[PDB]
Amino acid sequence: TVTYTARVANARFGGFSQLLLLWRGSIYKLLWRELLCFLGFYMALSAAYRFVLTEGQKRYFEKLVIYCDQYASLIPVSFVLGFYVTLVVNRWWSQYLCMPLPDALMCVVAGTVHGRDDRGRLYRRTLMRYAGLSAVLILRSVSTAVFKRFPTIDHVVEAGFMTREERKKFENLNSSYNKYWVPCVWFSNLAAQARREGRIRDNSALKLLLEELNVFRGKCGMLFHYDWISVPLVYTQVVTIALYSYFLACLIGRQFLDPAQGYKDHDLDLCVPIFTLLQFFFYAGWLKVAEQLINPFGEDDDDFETNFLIDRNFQVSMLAVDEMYDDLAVLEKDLYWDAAEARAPYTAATVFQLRQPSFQGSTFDITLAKEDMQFQ
Amino acid sequence: TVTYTARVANARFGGFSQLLLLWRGSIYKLLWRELLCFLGFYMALSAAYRFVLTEGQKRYFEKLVIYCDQYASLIPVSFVLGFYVTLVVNRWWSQYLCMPLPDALMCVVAGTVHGRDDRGRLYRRTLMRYAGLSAVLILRSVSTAVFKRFPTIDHVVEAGFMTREERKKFENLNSSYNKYWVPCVWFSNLAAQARREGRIRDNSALKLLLEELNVFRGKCGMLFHYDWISVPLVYTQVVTIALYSYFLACLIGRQFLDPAQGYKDHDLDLCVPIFTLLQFFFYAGWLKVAEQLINPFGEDDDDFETNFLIDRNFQVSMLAVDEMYDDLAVLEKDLYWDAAEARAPYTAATVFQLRQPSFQGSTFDITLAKEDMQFQ
Amino acid sequence: TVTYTARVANARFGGFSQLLLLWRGSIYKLLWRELLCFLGFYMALSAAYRFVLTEGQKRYFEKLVIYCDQYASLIPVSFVLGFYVTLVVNRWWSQYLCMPLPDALMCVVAGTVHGRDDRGRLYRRTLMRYAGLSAVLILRSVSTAVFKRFPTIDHVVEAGFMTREERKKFENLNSSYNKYWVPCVWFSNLAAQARREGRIRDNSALKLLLEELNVFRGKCGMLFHYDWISVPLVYTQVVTIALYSYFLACLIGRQFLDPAQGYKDHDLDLCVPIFTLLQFFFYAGWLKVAEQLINPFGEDDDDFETNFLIDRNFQVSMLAVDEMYDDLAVLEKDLYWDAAEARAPYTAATVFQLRQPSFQGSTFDITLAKEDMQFQ
Amino acid sequence: TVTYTARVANARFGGFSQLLLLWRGSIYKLLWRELLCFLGFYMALSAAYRFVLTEGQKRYFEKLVIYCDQYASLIPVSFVLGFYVTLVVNRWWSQYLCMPLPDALMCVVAGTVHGRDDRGRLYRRTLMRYAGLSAVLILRSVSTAVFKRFPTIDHVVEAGFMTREERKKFENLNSSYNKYWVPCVWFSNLAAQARREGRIRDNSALKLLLEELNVFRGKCGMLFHYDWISVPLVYTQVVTIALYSYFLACLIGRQFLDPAQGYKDHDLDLCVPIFTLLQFFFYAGWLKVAEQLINPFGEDDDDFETNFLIDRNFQVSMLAVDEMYDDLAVLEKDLYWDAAEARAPYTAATVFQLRQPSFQGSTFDITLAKEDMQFQ
Amino acid sequence: TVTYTARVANARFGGFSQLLLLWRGSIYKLLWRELLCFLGFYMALSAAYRFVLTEGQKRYFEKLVIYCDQYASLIPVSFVLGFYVTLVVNRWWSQYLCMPLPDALMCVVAGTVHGRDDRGRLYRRTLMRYAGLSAVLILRSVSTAVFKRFPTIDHVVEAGFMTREERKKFENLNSSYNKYWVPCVWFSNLAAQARREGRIRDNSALKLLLEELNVFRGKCGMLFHYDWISVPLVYTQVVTIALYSYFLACLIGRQFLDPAQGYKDHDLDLCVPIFTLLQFFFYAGWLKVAEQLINPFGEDDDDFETNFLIDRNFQVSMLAVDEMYDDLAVLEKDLYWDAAEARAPYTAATVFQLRQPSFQGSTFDITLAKEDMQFQ
Ligand SMILES: [Cl-]
């Protein structure tokens, strides 16, 4: 992920113009190769027309260029790109939202699975580890980066997400389908056991655990679905064909023709199709947006940092359910205990935010007349 | 389903251009027949104009071609295609999301319906089988592929989703409406029985089971609704008529006219309407997107693999609630038990993902001044 | 509702072209009258120009036609139609989703309201009848079809949804507002009574019943809201005015002018504005989409089959909570009891769906190198 | 709110054309003043050109008109209007959905807060009154109509939503922020008290009450958010500037020029810019859609009937929790008790809806062949 | 936030035209600098052409201007702006909706955490303070304004959101990741403790608290996600490049050429590109919409008032759970106790809202015929 939120935090002269100078995750990095290819084909045609063709071949080439220019219709292609890329961007954000995060589970497990002893620690850590393990199994199934981190289940074991006994059980399960869900069933069984032993003190707690389990497992499943059900291939081929047809029409019809021929709209020879090149950059980059986002789980600059998320999730969940279990600071009176109201101070750099009238609602400046406000 | 996620995983020179070479699920496979028909009509008209018509008939044909060219307006047709196809694509994804999946139920059933004995196994397996049976009943009602797998209820019985006693009960139910919901009521009754016998140990557990039951049953119902309430036929006819009218206007107005007549924009005879053909491919393919997706439950390449999902769901649910019931590996200390932090290693092929600064939030490089940070 | 899902199940040569031959629910059925009116006005103007006007009046008419042609701008009108019709279509689908369906309630009631005796039957049937009654009350308030089935509350009583004692209570309730919600309060009171008597065995069950009650009642309320809050009238008038202005501009500016006058783009007299007629069909039909969908509860071909849904819902709910209460087939071992795996067979017509590789995830063909997969 | 659902219930010749004759809530009512202003400016310019300017000033005016006509680009302005107005319309519907309605609470309170005595009545009525009071407080904060009904808290008290003791408590609360939430906290405290006294019989009931409380309170909060966070002012200014720039370009460039000058596309002097006027009506009305909907809580014709909703909600909630508490008709056998099936009759005016085949699913006419249906 | 809801409350002559006069949060404030730069470049080119270039250089400049004018295509750029800005606006609203608000928690805590004593006060205040503290930690991570208010954790402590003992615990937690979630785990542990001591009286109450905790914590997490996952940089660069390319094409191709040269569409020299300037204002402002909204957590006029929300949330939560705990006014009969119906009065300024017929549903004016309403 290429984060540039800090760069667009507060209004700056130029707006996004400053973002135009970024390389990592940039259109330039993604598009320079194709740009040069388009320019090379264009310049090869121009060179042929300028230095190879006979006079008659030149007149015919001019006829072809003029005819082809009529078909460089950016309107429809703009329509299709807009709709298709918007679909892809929305799908990409939804996928990111389907990443399984243990925070909700870790809150519930810290609050409901009890015991300072080793057995209670084992329960809490094992439940969170099962969640992380389901996450790892699915992510290695859908993400190139995570897979290359865990190319085999042996790696998952050596990395500590799965124990050896667990792998024996996992492997003996006779299923030809992806087993990412297996740790979630392990979680359910362990939670039921914890309740039976009384580590979970009430049935409502066990219900809360199972609910959050299924929220987490549902996110894992959603990741599988997004990996499996691509954007319809036919649609992608359609949009690509539209774009490439536009580029063909442009690479022929944007040729600079001899001004001495006096053709309409061919009076200036620039030798370099500057505006055609900018148009190519715009439209090809627009499609590149979809090309980047259609599979966000790779090793690219702006792909999701899935391995980072795995590390963070495991470390934080372990801390939450083990180090922080039943380790509160003593209840003490807060700074505003004796204060009827409460407002933390402001720094000198922020006190200006004050003195802005406190919004109460849009109606509170109407100033109605007396006789009008009398009840019937 | 034609999965091509692996092909668009990491940025590749050309982007989708590589997808243009795919046959299964492709625009080419879906469109070649119509393409050839359009070309045949176009070439028949051209042949008539070139070799049959008298001189006067040729002048009149030229007048008609010029007049018809004015009406080949791809702008509006692009609008309508964009909006309509987007609606269809969104509906298609929503339908896929309404496929009933037992994973949530199987987690709950593994965690809440107890007993290693045969009776407990019977309870768990029967509940999951009822879920799968509702799924089969609805899918055979809405999916051509599943129906051809289960053309009669006898097939459902022989396949083991419904027992003989159950079919007697199912058939005696006097209802003229689709009975896919019947196993969900069976599920509810059986769950209540399991609670009464104490196999379900608490009321909160029975509530969780019934909640997940209704989530699953609601997905089944949603499938029925999507099958029943088509995209409004009037809308589909409107978009089709717009497209075909464009194709008529093009098949006449894109004829190559005799350059010797010196008509404006008719100076080059290519004999093959290359750009018109590409435009036809683009627009007809764009509509084909909707045509493919409007009913995703058939036997086409990119239709949902419903029978595969049935197999997977049944096998996995059975495993989860029967083989994996109360079969945990012993609680054991994990690899990171004694480690204050925790981070699994990286493979040599992935360690580069490290050393990327750990994102903490966009504000954490601001570097405010000392006097500014003093509280008021 | 005009269901055509079966027609677009599997890819067919022509795609939607086959749908163009449908009459029920079709654009033709909805639009022929207006089409003929447009053609009649057009032909009346043409007849006047051809056979009534003096020479000078003809020159002036030609000037007017040429001027009016400049204003037949289908671009903006396409924009507004796209956005407005899309809003209407989405609203229409949301409305359909707000139809109250008893299936969830019937599952809960079958599972939670107990007793094979007459009193238990009375409880279950009465709860489901109250749900159906709320549905009937709201549907008769928002649907012309349902209202004409139940033009008075007396009809509701004679149809059995409301008893005589209930109507006395219903009518004595002093409320000037729509009383569709009254049976939902009756439901809540009866459920509380059932719990008090122990017919509902636990508080979590009563909570589940009340939750599903409010889901159902919320759907009823949503139907009321959709009936009350139209699409803003101003918006509808705006889109209609845009469309009609286009049609005026076309009915004047698409007149065939005398070719002997030699006006630009007026060289061919077809006597019939074929492409103008197709354009009218397209655009007027596009708006007709909204016109049909804006109120989906009437007696039209593609309106929702609300009366059918009432019949189905009542019959199915009654069956579920009465005939099927506590009437399970004996628990018996399933066909796959002794099978470690499980897969139902395939018919000869479907076995081809097999042998397609079982999708495990997009990463599982990467084939990493040995030294790359070593952990750091 | 201007309800016109009944007018568009069933297909009618002309479709929306009949809606064009409506005045209340209409584009005409909202736009006539601006229309006349545009026409007045246009006619003032035309009068100057026709009767004031010298010959040279006329040639220069003609040059200006021709130049200005090039910039009347309705395409982009159509784009921006489409996107912006769609955003506003969606926001408007979401706001309406955030109106707090007591129906869910009243169902729960009727079902869970017990006692026919005066104390039980006090509990139920007071809880519902607290909900209504929160609704009133927020609505008077966000709605001009409601505020003018309750310009001061004294009005709220005299209207009975807040008692005198409650106002003392409400006013003594030292908070500079809007206090609409205070009755929701009162509700929570009272509910906890009711449970403590046993008026609420179980903890699951109290939980249901608090859940529905927070749903209601969340809707109130959402109303505050929509009131506070306008559509970004910059966006609104952008769209307005685009529209007005188009109107400037049109008011100059749509001037009728002297045909004797023989300028291209200026050959007919109509003296009245009919199509320009229709275009103004269309585009200005399109923006008026947003202008009407951007704040739906005023006293306009099509603003939400917030005061009506207050009246209805209070009356209905009071009836539901007080008059209808524990006042069921005796459980009695329904009309279909002895009937295996069940279907209410149809009126002569609706029986035609019958005989339409009962939809069972799209697959149930496939008619597979015998040998194909054999299992492998 | 620049609230202008009160200005667009009721229809006003001109509609948004009055908003065009606003400075704070306005397009003018955001765009004047760029506007002047565009005008300066344009005027520098014009000055060069008018006063520096030789005659031949002038003919060549004219050729360049004419060629460049062909490429000022506002159509596609309008498409891309529409789609991209709409995505940004929707994301902005979603972000605002992810702001963590304690109101739901404070309702639950006031209702479920009991005791008038100091210990009960400590429990309630500490739980709400933990929620506020998580909110502060995340907001200082994602918001420039909040960060500059709390540049260091020491500020958080001195402001009273975190105690000294809590900071010791917070700092000793060995985690390299953002710790905003830590107070939510503290909350869970404290809630479990409160239940264990009986301050929380039932398990369903503790479950409700933990559910609302995770709703709140999920909002905090969502804020982190929105801060981290920018709108894809490639997309932003694409849209910016499209816009700037249009501005380049305009700054050259909108030059006023010498009318004495008699070029087509260059007959009037205005010296100031009025319409080009308006177009620049429109399009650049349209992009500015996204530029403003892409990061809404800064110190700009229309950024979210995050510090205000912190103050309000803390003060209100403290009041709700401490001052207002178990402090109800005595249950008393309401004004409408003895009234069968109930309707609060109207002010003279609002009674007109009455006499509008009370909407009962769209069907209730149909007036069916007698023989038609007979049941079959
Ligand atoms: Cl619960």
> Which percent band covers the strand fraction of chain A?
under 5%
| Classification by helices and strands of chain A | mainly alpha
Task: Spell out the helices and strands of chain A N to C.
Answer: HHHHHHHHHHHHH
Report on the biggest sheet of chain A.
none
Q: In one word, what is the shape of chain A?
A: extended
Q: How many helical stretches of chain A? A: 13
Helical proportion of chain A, percent range: 55-70%
User: Mind telling me the C-alpha Rg of chain A?
Assistant: 31 Å
The first-to-last residue Cα distance of chain A is 63 Å
Number of extended strands of chain A: 0
Chain pair sharing the greatest interface: A-B, 121 and 117 residues
PDB class: transport protein
Keywords: Ion channel, chloride channel, anion channel, pentamer, transport protein
Assembly: pentameric
Entry title: hBest2 Ca2+-unbound closed state
What does this structure look like?
The structure is a homopentamer of 376-residue chains. With 376 residues, chain A is an all-alpha fold. Among the domains of chain A are: 17-74 and 241-293, no CATH class; 103-229, no CATH class. Helices cover 59% and strands 0% of the residues of chain A. The first copy, chain A, is built from 13 helices and no strands. Chain A has helices at residues 27-51, 55-69, 74-97, 103-112, 118-142, 144-149, 153-158, 164-172, 182-197, 203-228, 233-253, 274-293, 306-323. In chain A, helix 4 (103-112) packs parallel to helix 13. The N and C termini of chain A lie far apart (63 Å). The interface between A and B is large, with 121 and 117 residues.
